[PDB]
Each structure stands twice: as C-alpha cells, then as structure tokens.
Paper text:
D-cysteine (D-Cys) moieties are found in firefly luciferin, semisynthetic cephalosporin MT141 and malformin A. [name] ([name]) is suggested to take part in the catabolic degradation of D-Cys and D-Cys-containing toxic compounds. The polypeptide fold of StDCyD is similar to those of other fold type II PLP-dependent enzymes and consists of a small domain (residues 48–161) and a large domain (residues 1–47 and 162–328). As in other PLP-dependent fold type II enzymes, the active site is situated in a large crevice between the two domains. StDCyD is specific for D-Cys and βCDA, and shows no activity with ACC, although it shares significant sequence identity with ACCDs.
Structures of two distinct crystal forms of recombinant StDCyD were determined by the molecular replacement method. In the form I structure, there are two dimers (AB and CD) and in form II structure, there are four dimers (AB, CD, EF and GH) in the asymmetric unit that are similar to the dimeric organization found in other fold type II PLP-dependent enzymes. Electron density map of unliganded StDCyD revealed a significant patch of density with tetrahedral geometry at the active site that could be interpreted as a sulphate (in form I crystal structure) or a phosphate (in form II crystal structure). Form I crystals were obtained in a condition which had sulphate while conditions for obtaining form II had phosphate ions. These ions could be refined to reasonable B factors that were close to those of the surrounding atoms. Therefore, Form II structure has been utilized only for qualitative analysis.
Numbering used by the authors:
A (entry chain B): 6 to 328
B (entry chain A): -1 to 328
Amino acid sequence: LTRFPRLEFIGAPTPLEYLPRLSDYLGREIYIKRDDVTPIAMGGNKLRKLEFLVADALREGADTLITAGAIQSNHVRQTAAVAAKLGLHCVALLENPIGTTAENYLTNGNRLLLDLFNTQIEMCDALTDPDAQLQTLATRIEAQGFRPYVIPVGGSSALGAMGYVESALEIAQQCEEVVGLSSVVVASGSAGTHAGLAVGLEHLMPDVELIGVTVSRSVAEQKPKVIALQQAIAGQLALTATADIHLWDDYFAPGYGVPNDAGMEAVKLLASLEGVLLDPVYTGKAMAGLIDGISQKRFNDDGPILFIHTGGAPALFAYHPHV
Amino acid sequence: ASMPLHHLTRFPRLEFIGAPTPLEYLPRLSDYLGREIYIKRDDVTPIAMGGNKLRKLEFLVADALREGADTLITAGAIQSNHVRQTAAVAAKLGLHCVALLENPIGTTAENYLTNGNRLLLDLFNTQIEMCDALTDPDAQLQTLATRIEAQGFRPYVIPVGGSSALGAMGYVESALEIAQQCEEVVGLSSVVVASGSAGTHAGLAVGLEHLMPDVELIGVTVSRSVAEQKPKVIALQQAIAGQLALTATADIHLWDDYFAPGYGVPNDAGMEAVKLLASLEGVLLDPVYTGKAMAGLIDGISQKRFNDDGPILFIHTGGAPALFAYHPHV
C-alpha cells in the first residue's frame, strides 16, 4: 500500500448507497458509490487523484499547477480549486473538442468556475499531443518566474490512479457482510480511475467483474491505455496484475463530449427516479451502458451491480440548451 | 447533558444527511481578514447538490409521510434552493412534487429562466406552475393543494423555504453538531448565517441559546429590513421553543445592510465575497444568500460590529447552483 504521500481532501469515506427505486425498475440489485459527494468545489473522481498528485507537487516545492483538458473539464475545475485552496497558481490549457459556438458551453458550467478560481487560461486548437504541449507550457512558465508542476490529462498517471486503488479499499470494506457484489461499472476516459480500480479490485475482490464504459475511444484504442496504467500502478505498488480489463465502446455515440439520447435518457432516469444527478459527458453514458448491459445479459451473472458515480454534474448547466 | 434538548425528540426525522457535515477552519481567509474564521459546511450533502433546506425537509417530509401524502407541494423563486431540494427528495422517495414559482426580480435573462436550479427541476419531473407574485404564499399554496386534492390525490404542503416551526427543527439539531464539533476544539465567539424565510436562523437561535449561551448569533437579512424581519424570526423562535418544551429569551440579532437592491438581486459587496472565497479558499458561495451573508461577515469585522475579537463560525447554507443561473447577468 503506502509510501506515497497523499493529501487530505476527501475526509470521511464517500457514502455507498442502495438505489431501491432504480433497482426495482430495472429488475436488478443496483448500488451507487457516491464519489460526487466531496467537500471541494462540487467534487468528483478527479479529486481522489489530486490527493496524491498535489501532495507530490508540494514535495517538489511547486508554486503552480499546470494541466489541460476540454473547456468543460471536471479535472481542470477540481485542479483549479485545490490550487486556490492551497495557494498555488493554476494554469490551464483548454480545447473546444466538439467545435461548438453555444454560449453556455463556452462560458458557463465548469468554465465559469475556473474564472472564480482565478485560473490562468490558455486556449489551443486541439490537444493533439498533450504531454508535449503541457511541457512546452511548463518551460515557458519556468521562465516567467514560476516553479510549476505538471498534471497529465484527467490526472491519469501511475501516481494519480493511486486514489482509485485506495478507493477499492473503501468499496470492499463498505460491502463487507453488507453486500454480495457481483459487478462494478465505471466510466473509462483518461483511464486512471478504471485502472486504479482494476488493480485494487483484482487484489481485494477478485470475483467481482469490472466493466468500464468508454466515453471517448473504442475498445481497440482504449484497452492498451488501461492495461498500461494497470501494469505501471501494479509495478509501483509492488504487486502483480493478471486481471483482464473489460470495456464496452457502444455508448459514447458521436464521440467525447457529444451527448447521445441513450446517455441523456439515463440522466433523466436517475434524476427523476432516485434524485441523483448524472452528467451528459461521463456518468450518463456510463449509466446508459449499465442499463443496456442488463438489457443484453452482458454481465457475468444476475447479481448486484455497483455504479461508480464519478460526478460531473456541473456540466449540466454548461450543456444547457444544446450543442 | 446535551439534555435540555432531550424533549426535542418526539419529532420523527428522516435520514437524508447521514454523517454530520464537516466544520472546517479557513486559514487563508482568516489570515487575510485578521480573525479566526470557521465554516460549517451544510452545502456538502448527498442529495442533489445539497443545502440548509434539506435539514428542514428531514422533519417535514418525515411528517408528510406520516400523513400518508403522495405529493409534496411548495413555492418559491424560480431559482429557489428549497424547491430544488424538495423536488429531489420527492423523486428519491417516489412522491410527486408540485412547485409554485415566481420571477421575483423581473428578469428576462435566459439563464435565470431555464438554467441553474430551474433546470434540475425538469430533470426531477416537477409539476411546475407559474404565478405573477407570491403575494400571499400560505393561501396560494392551500388554493393549489385543494385543487390537487380534488383530482383524487394526497398532498402535503411545505411552507416557503420550509420555514415552519417543525422545519426549523433541523437547525435546532444542527446546533447540537456545531457545539459538539467545537468542544475542546474551538472557543467560538460569533456565528453568522443568512436570514431569509427565517427557519434556519430561528432553529439556530433556540439550539444555541441552550447549548452555547455565550455565543453571539448574527443573521444577515437577504430580503427584508431589520424592521420587517425581526418579528418573523422571533415568532419561530417562540413556536420552536414552545414545541420543544423550552423557554427562549435570547435577543435575535439582524443586519439589513447587505441585501442591497433586494431579494435575488446581486450586489457588488456580496459577489466580491463570492470571488474572495472561491479564489482564496476554493469554496463556492452564491449570489442570492451565502455571498451576501459573507459580505456582511466581512464588513462586520471591518466595523467592529461583533461583541468581541474571537472566532466566527460561518454557516454555509449552500445555494451554489444559482451561480450557473445568474451567469452572465441579471
């Protein structure tokens, strides 16, 4: 487990809850891991990552955090908050990945908060090669008088994903004597969350089937990225990881950041039926998957399914009327 | 010996909140303002983005269920935090939710009209009815209740902001957490909270008169003047104390200077507070309630308004979502 300094951003373990109404409607035991409920600026999965990341950034004596992502990036929002909380500067590199002109995407939702957090924001046409474009930026800042720290896209680095390894610890304990868990669903993006789970859950709950719903890439393009982190995480944790990574690509429809009916139906469903807010870019699509999953008997057995609510809610106000 | 409350447990409460919300020190802000400042994070709540209104609903909806109601009715501004939370609890529990909304600032700005809280209401499948003003809420709600009643349904009415004698029990019980958290940990001197539909302020004033009698409790009005507000708070204090089998003699304190043009209109002073807390501590306040309250807390220190120099606890009552509603302006 430990030798990696983590910061305390989350406090108590996030609640795990049963979703009786949804369960009864779908005809399956469904549980929810509430990682959206977090003290820091509306919270999210990204924070568990930043707990290790920023801890490290401080060891480096950095006075600035740099990172990149979509305009409505949950990661940037959380990063920028943590920054402000701690007194670090935050430079953010953003791309408009869907090529929209809609006011609310451009200024509202997450993006709006970044301004409140006094984030230094730079635009670019695309993040064709992030790690390089970030390093380009870092060094320019390194020059301007700032001692940075670079956080990868989505905070998905070997170290970052440590958050979700530790997450599995909570998850298994919470389920001890309390639930006979069969499957776990989580959105698979920048990969670190999925990966961290896969390492932790191989070692803590080896019988549990772990499904990732791709939000951007196909199984083809995604699987390698996940496996890479799995191995690296396992490497640094001094463990071995032999678990197969599972992924379903059918649910991200037009592509990253574009909303599908299938996913949007899942948002309306969970809000109306359970009073929980998903989001149109990540959790909604993941949930749409979970739903169609039961529909097509895709999971290993009939038993309990745990959905990892990774947050993202604020995006709702950004996506508001459309496009 | 958190005891004089004891009698304070004949009211069935639902469990929406779980663990006690975190109380935190605000080191950067403190150091900046030159005062020990603590924050009670009642915005951190599992239910649909959370808020103070939920601690109220914990008693209110519990009661609604005892009545066997299958519908909750309530009213407020378009961007009402209370309606959002009410409608959520509704959907979670499987009750219908009818909401009576007014546009209280007379704006035409898209984002106020459709975004922020109002947006979520649609996701929660809230039955929504518009009116020109809530000139007399209790009556306009009952008018609505009985029309629903006679379509063959079972409706429970929740006052504006959930501020009834019962509702405010949530914040009586909140006082318990607060004092328990500060035990040996902080020598608390003042508490600041927004004072609106009154229940939250009131509940605190009873609980804190009995649990921390030395603590000065300040309410920053967000809609009315000291003149018009004080009676409404005193009424709830007494009704609450009545039903809790206690006596309440504590003076209620109120500062009206900070709501500027009126309820739901943002002032510079208040927004300055939003930017300050976001940038300096990474906490999000809101432009209708918490911001203004905070603006008050700040100007308070500025004018030596509090009794002494000591620690101030700020009650973060939530409201954040309103930010995306108020977005570019008006």
